Amino acid sequence: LDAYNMMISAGFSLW
Amino acid sequence: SMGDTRPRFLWQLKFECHFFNGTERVRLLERCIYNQEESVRFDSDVGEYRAVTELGRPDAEYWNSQKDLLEQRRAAVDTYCRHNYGVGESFTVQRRVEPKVTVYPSKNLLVCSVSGFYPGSIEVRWFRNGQEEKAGVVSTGLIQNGDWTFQTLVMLETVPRSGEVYTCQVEHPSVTSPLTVEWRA
Amino acid sequence: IKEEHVIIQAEFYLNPDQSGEFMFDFDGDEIFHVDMAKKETVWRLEEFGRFASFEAQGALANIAVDKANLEIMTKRSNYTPITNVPPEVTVLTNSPVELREPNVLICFIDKFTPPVVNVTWLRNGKPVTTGVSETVFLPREDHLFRKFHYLPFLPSTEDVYDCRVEHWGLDEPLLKHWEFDA
C-alpha cells in the first residue's frame, strides 16, 4: 500500500 | 495526583497542505505554536521562514541559514502535499456516503432529519404542495459527528392544513437524483 | 482562489505531563493518529488501513524533537506558562432518538487548551466507566483543541445522562445534561 509521508520536525539551535 | 496545579507548557507543530482545484495549486504552511501563540512559520508562497512573534525570530534566522532544510521545505508541495493527496484521494476526496432522510413533526414544526452523509456540501429544501418554503426555515447547521459523517436537522415552521403535502428534498453528491420525503397531514 | 481541501499533520508535546500527540486531519476529520503508548498507527476508520499505510516510527522521532524544542522555547520565554482556556461542551446523538432503538450519545468538547481533560459519562448520576469511545485531541485554527466521546446506548425515559468535564480552565466540573423527551 502507498504510504502517507510526514514532514520531519526541525530542531532549534541549542545555543 | 490530586491538587496538580503545576504550570503547563505546550508546543504544537502543524504542517498544513492547502489544495485548490485538485492539486493544480498547492500551498504548504508550517506553523510552530508555543502555548496558544504561533511564533514562526514557513509559507511555501514565501519560501523561507518568517517570525510571527519576536520570540520566534531566533528560529527563523537559524532555520533560514540551513540550505538543506529550506530546499526540503521548498520541495514539499510536491514530495509531501501532492504525494499525500494522491495517497488518500480515493477514500477521502472521493468518499461519498448517502444520508438517511426522515421527516417527523416536533410536538407547528416539521423536522427533516438528514443523517450520516459525506461530504459536507448538501442542499436541503422544503416544499408545500410543490412550492418552496423559505421564510420559516431554520436548521441546526452542519454537524460534524467526528466519524467522517455529518448530520443536520432542517425544520419548517408551518400551520398544517388537511390535504397539504410537505416535501423535504435533499441534493447531495452521493446521489444522482434528489432524495425526497413527504409528510401528509 | 477556491480552497477545496486541507490536510494537516498536527503534533504536540506538553510538559510537565510528558504527553505527546501526532495525527493527520483531512478537512476537519481525523485520518489517523499514532498511539503513543502502543506506538502504532490507529486509523480513524478501520478500513483506511486497507487503503494506505503510515510508518509510526518517524512520528515517534518527531515527538523527540518536539520535546527538545518545547524545552528550549519554555526557557526562552522565561517559563511563561499556558493560559487555560475552558471547554465548551455539547451533547448530541448520532440520529434522532427512538425508544429502545440503539443510538450513540456524543459529547463534543471544544475550544480548550491545554489538551488535558477528564470526561466522564454519568447515567442517572452514576459513572459509565466502560463502553465509551473517545478521540484524541483534534486541532483548531485558533490552536485550541476539540474532542469527541461516544456512548452507545438504548434510549429510555428511565435514564438521564450527563457529560461531566473537568479542566483547569473551569471553576467547577461542567455537566451537560441530556434526556429522552418521549
Author numbering:
A (entry chain C): 1 to 15
B (entry chain B): -1 to 105, 113 to 190
C (entry chain A): 1 to 182
Which text from the study accompanies this structure?
Once again, nsp146420–6434 satisfied 3/4 of the allowed HLA-DR1 pocket anchors: P1-Tyr, P4-Met, and P6-Ser, while P9-Phe represented a deviation. The incorporation of P9-Phe was reminiscent of the similar S486–505 (also P9-Phe), which bound HLA-DR1 at weak affinity.
CD4+ T cells recognize a broad range of peptide epitopes of severe acute respiratory syndrome coronavirus 2 (SARS-CoV-2), which contribute to immune memory and limit COVID-19 disease. Analyzing six epitopes, some with very low binding affinity, we solve X-ray crystallographic structures of each bound to HLA-DR1.
